[PDB]
Amino acid sequence: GTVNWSVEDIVKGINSNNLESQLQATQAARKLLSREKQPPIDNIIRAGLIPKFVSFLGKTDCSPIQFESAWALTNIASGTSEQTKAVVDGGAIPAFISLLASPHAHISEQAVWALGNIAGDGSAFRDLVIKHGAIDPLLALLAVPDLSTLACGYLRNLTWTLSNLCRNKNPAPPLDAVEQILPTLVRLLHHNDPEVLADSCWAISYLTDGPNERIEMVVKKGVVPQLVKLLGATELPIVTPALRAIGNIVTGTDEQTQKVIDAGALAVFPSLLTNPKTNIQKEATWTMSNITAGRQDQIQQVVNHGLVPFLVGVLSKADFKTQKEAAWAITNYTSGGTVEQIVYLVHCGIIEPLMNLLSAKDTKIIQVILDAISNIFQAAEKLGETEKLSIMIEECGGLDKIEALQRHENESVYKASLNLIEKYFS
């Protein structure tokens, strides 16, 4: 019936002054735009249909054409920035915000989705969606005693759109918008649907990806224990944003870092640092590196939780970008650690896999590693035990490596090698 129309036929019907012909043509547009293989978005745009669709959003008298045009506009807005811009340029934002109040769930849901696509384009349209007042009617859709009474697909769309209002970083979303959204995000973080949980975690990971004051607004909401719990989820789509969020939080202050430690996060890192998903291992190890950049009592928690052997393991075998985060984790550890903490690191076997990574081509990890060795020697000096570390480093081929880097394109590698050699190998 409305399957496989031409754009010309769609235009013919939409330009009729027959609401029912317009409705059928709009549905035909929507089915065209709904196909997975090359939906003719630009042809639809070029035909001048967006303003018509937008005006159909206002036809309260004809809810099906509201839905069809909402769906059509959603899929145009799902495209490139220029395609999303065409939807915004047609005045769709306030019209979609008005549809949030529709008594038809499938129509307000489509409007939720469309606003999510628009906000998802970037911070400019995100903030424009906010300026048009989308947040209050979005949150009002979630103002029910129990989220479980809402349709699951409906709740997932709302969560996803809310997460796009939290997304993107220059600028980050307006502070008052974040504060307005955060109590609903906290609630969604306790809902029992894995996709709502994943998208709530994504939203929190965006909100915590910024300066310490952004992290603080989230941490002050009390969500870190829940994040840590989600960190133990079996669903990778939940663990990944939950870990990004936890990792972001530990980029903040020592006090914000302490709250993820207090919440039990370190007990999950044996799994995370051996996780089969390399991106999880990289994130977990990056997170570990920022925890070992903390206080000695925080380094001590890493020790107590048995995590140094896991860092030795990741240094020993992991994809290179994880090994580099492990190298950073070690250098941070050796920079802030006590002497006995640094000794324990050597006792756990850090030296050999550290030396093996001096053969890496990446010259930054070499600086990281030589800095760590320097700090370990500095602790060995405080114990009179510089020689047996020199032997240890020599016995595994590390002296060969420090001698190699003696000649190296980079001046900072260059210098740290010979200084280590002249001071500890003579």
């Binding site: 990792g247 980029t251 990056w286 590196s289 903390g294 580099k324 985060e325 920079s335 802030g336």
Partner: peptide, 9 residues
């Protein structure tokens, strides 16, 4: 408020 912290690379 801790210069040793690193953002993602």
């Amino acid at each position: 408020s801790n210069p040793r912290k690193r953002h993602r690379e």
